[PDB]
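<tokenise_the_fold>
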Amino acid sequence: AMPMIEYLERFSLKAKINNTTNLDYSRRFLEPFLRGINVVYTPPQSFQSAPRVYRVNGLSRAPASSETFEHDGKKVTIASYFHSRNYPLKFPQLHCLNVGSSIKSILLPIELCSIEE
């Protein structure tokens, strides 16, 4: 598993990667580029889930700092969602990956995604 963040830094930015770097604009322009890819999502062990390969429809219309999602009739934000799940996000203020389907969109920051070499 090659960290998708590593891919972004080396290939997408050609510079330094971080939330302090303008990966936001890279996120928005890479949307069609990632639309139709497969990534291995490495879940924090608080999730108790196995590294799952998700099919990327694309990227979310909003950054994970603003993106709320319905989980059991309750909406929370992905930034706080991972943070309380014992995974402090390094890219919380950036767009989240949209995998799965239109009916149920799995939104996960590309920080936790790895690309299968």
User: Anything to note?
Assistant: The helical segments are 4-13, 23-29, 31-34, 78-84. Residues 1-117 form a domain with the paz domain fold (CATH 2.170.260.10). The CA atoms of residues 96 and 108 lie 5 Å apart. The chain is about 25% helix and 35% strand.
